[PDB]
Amino acid sequence: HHHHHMVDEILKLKKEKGYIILAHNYQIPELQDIADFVGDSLQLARKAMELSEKKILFLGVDFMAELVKILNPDKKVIVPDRSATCPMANRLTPEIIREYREKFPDAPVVLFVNSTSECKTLADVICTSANAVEVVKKLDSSVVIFGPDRNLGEYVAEKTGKKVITIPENGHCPVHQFNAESIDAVRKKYPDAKVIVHPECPKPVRDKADYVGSTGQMEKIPERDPSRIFVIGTEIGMIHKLKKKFPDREFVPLEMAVCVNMKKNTLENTLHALQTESFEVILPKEVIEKAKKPILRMFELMG
Numbered sequence: 025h026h027h028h029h030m031v032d033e034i035l036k037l038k039k040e041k042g043y044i045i046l047a048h049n050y051q052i053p054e055l056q057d058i059a060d061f062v063g064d065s066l067q068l069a070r071k072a073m074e075l076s077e078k079k080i081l082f083l084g085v086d087f088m089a090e091l092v093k094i095l096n097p098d099k100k101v102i103v104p105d106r107s108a109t110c111p112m113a114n115r116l117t118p119e120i121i122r123e124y125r126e127k128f129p130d131a132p133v134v135l136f137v138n139s140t141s142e143c144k145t146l147a148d149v150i151c152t153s154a155n156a157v158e159v160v161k162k163l164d165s166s167v168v169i170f171g172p173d174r175n176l177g178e179y180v181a182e183k184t185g186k187k188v189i190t191i192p193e194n195g196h197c198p199v200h201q202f203n204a205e206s207i208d209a210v211r212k213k214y215p216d217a218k219v220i221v222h223p224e225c226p227k228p229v230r231d232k233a234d235y236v237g238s239t240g241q242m243e244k245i246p247e248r249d250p251s252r253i254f255v256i257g258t259e260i261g262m263i264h265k266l267k268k269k270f271p272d273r274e275f276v277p278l279e280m281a282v283c284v285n286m287k288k289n290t291l292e293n294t295l296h297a298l299q300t301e302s303f304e305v306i307l308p309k310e311v312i313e314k315a316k317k318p319i320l321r322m323f324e325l326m327g
């Protein structure tokens with residue numbers, strides 16, 4: 025195998041230098057396969073807090089790596105590509121959050137994990153796709169400010185029955201803009217398939233699905249649903265994860281959908297990261313101290 029040189033040296037250096045490799049579900053298959061743990065933002069956050077190792081190689085995008093750092097301030101966290109980010113976040117600013125806080129004083133500010141760490145410093149609680157509904161339901165308010173993802177916010181409003189004020193204008197994930205016709209086509213081709221789509225998908229897509237869930241929730245659905253075929257409306261990296269967990273089922277992409285940022289991490293730059301022990305994720309202590317409050321509050325609202 026042509027890659028065995030990179031794969032083998034990654035596994036070698038990881039062990040030799042005391043790293044644990046955490047990968048998000050949207051990383052390329054080759055990186056999922058060398059990771060110690062693969063999961064969604066919530067799971068990688070949880071895992072981060074309980075690992076004994078002092079060095080983490082994080083494979084995902086920056087806001088997530090920073091979440092890991094904020095929860096583990098005394099561990100060294102590195103990433104292979106320091107530009108891997110989520111473009112949705114960067115429309116949401118401090119001045120937007122402040123404006124809406126003033127406008128709606130008694131609305132808690134719920135920020136999605138893909139938000140700048142600076143933004144998290146101004147949140148009342150953080151959430152991921154997996155726990156957004158649970159977090160907002162358990163809050164003591166019928167109104168929340170929510171950002172940056174509009175679709176997710178609207179889905180939360182639907183599930184909880186609360187008023188969700190989304191910020192900024194049109195915050196959305198380009199990856200999850202499937203058109204509902206793809207579901208129409210796939211129902212005809214596989215009449216017994218179950219269609220699972222992400223809550224970041226637009227509402228007409230959500231409404232034609234059998235299930236709506238985050239990647240963490242998608243992965244649990246075949247534990248309770250015996251269907252032979254699932255059609256998956258998220259980023260393409262999740263197909264590899266699902267096929268590995270459930271080799272006796274068939275997983276069909278709703279459409280091909282690739283997150284360019286998530287794909288910035290490669291075997292080659294992952295190897296460079298382990299050789300140089302770069303690039304370190306660094307936040308000001310002030311940011312860490314401030315941002316951890318809404319993150320810990322998330323965990324209090326789950327259990």
Ligand SMILES: N=C(C(=O)O)[C@H](CC(=O)CO)C(=O)O
Binds near residue numbers: 237239
């Ligand atoms: N980290 C996620 C989450 O659940 O919060 C992603 C979705 C996301 O938008 C981040 O790329 C997912 O696992 O379903």
Ligand code: SF4
Binds near residue numbers: 112197200286
């Ligand atoms: S898949 Fe969408 S929400 Fe997740 S990092 Fe890429 S652009 Fe951001």
